[PDB]
């Protein structure tokens, strides 16, 4: 899991 | 067109999940050659997120189905010129992130969180990249991904703390970067660890805007730590 | 390519979920004349189903933007502009599918299974032209929508059983042109009711082939009877 | 709504 969107 | 224009017709392809027109509109804001704020910033990484993530996704399917199918040569060989194909675009497109990255986000970064953003940036689509690159290229593929990545991580460390969704986000990428594409995974967890241990020493640190972020961030890097150990 | 050889790389299209892809080796295999088995039926079914529906769901988006941003002219006819170009987008793909039903599905069908099918499509097609017409355009589209779905439903009621999926599916979607395009709860339900009970009262009919698509129907038949009731 | 794909 690399980073998801979070905006 | 006009900046403005150009930003709310990218929020409007988003809504519209129409990633390809969110792009570019966000390729043409870039190419205007003034430094992105924060929520242009964003918006880009969003768009192209997208663009590559569909080609991504699809990858990975119908490189299963290429693996699946060994002795099943027709079955096999449709899959390998289908990932071919497919590397094509993916290839573009992260040529397309790599080359506004290099002529216009990194060089006009004047503050150290957006070099650290748009250096991780450049890691990511060079990891990107290396998921699908073989033989001659890969390893220089591979080395500029982990230049990128490094040299981000030592500006997060002496600018920003340990608690900084933007300095954890690149230590859960980079982390992956060791665990995907490096085979490494020793490092790989020694630097989820670290940046996690480290986030927690210091919770006194996160702020209210950023504190939910950073929180689920610290939780993905222990997702992966404990998928990593078992 | 060979016929088989585009409907396998259909099959790969669809579960990468490139359904241009899908639908552009579909298209290909209606247009070398031959009528289409069950399965390449199926897969033009899905590749345009998934091409339309990206265009519905994001027309249905930008013009609930553009409803909502009366007093702000710039962003309203920015929502307008885009909301024209999904439209001729949806009109384009509606008008690919129509058209290979006017030439190769519909004249070829030699059982009225297919011949169901392909009616059916067409009131589809036109009922999403519908959804996006104007007064003046609008009520010849209604109208060629309700012929095809109206001989379709002859056509499936004398010659196929009350659980044949085609026929269910072909009931369900001609509810909901009553419901959302004639706005006649009313006859939406009889109809979905009508088809619910006739089915429900000859469960042994089912083969093993057909019983979950055919249960599945009905149990969206009564989804809809229990929404528009209330 | 409408018929899903199967």
Not at chain 2, 127 to 140: P, Q
Not at chain 2, 178 to 189: F, R
């Amino acid at each position: 899991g690399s980073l998801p969107d979070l905006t | 067109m006009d900046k403005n224009e150009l930003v709310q017709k990218a929020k409007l392809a988003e809504q519209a999940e129409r990633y390809d027109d969110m792009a570019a509109c966000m390729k043409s804001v870039t190419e205007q050659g003034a430094e992105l704020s924060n929520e242009e910033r964003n918006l880009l990484s969003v768009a192209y997120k997208n663009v590559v993530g569909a080609r991504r996704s699809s990858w990975r399917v119908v490189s299963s189905i290429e693996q699946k199918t060994e002795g099943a040569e027709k079955k096999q060989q449709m899959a390998r010129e289908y990932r071919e194909k497919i590397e094509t675009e993916l290839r573009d497109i992260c040529n397309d992130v790599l080359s506004l990255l290099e002529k216009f986000l990194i060089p006009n970064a004047s503050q150290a969180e957006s070099k650290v953003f748009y250096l991780k940036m450049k890691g990511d689509y060079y990891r990107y990249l290396a998921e699908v690159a073989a033989g001659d290229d890969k390893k220089g593929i591979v080395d500029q991904s982990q230049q990128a990545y490094q040299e981000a991580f030592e500006i997060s460390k002496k600018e920003m703390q340990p608690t900084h969704p933007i300095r954890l986000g690149l230590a859960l990428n980079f982390s992956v970067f060791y665990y995907e594409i490096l085979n490494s995974p020793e490092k790989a967890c020694s630097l989820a660890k670290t940046a996690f241990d480290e986030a927690i020493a210091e919770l006194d640190t996160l702020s209210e805007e950023s504190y939910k972020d950073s929180t689920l961030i610290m939780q993905l890097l222990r997702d992966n730590l404990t998928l990593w150990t078992s």
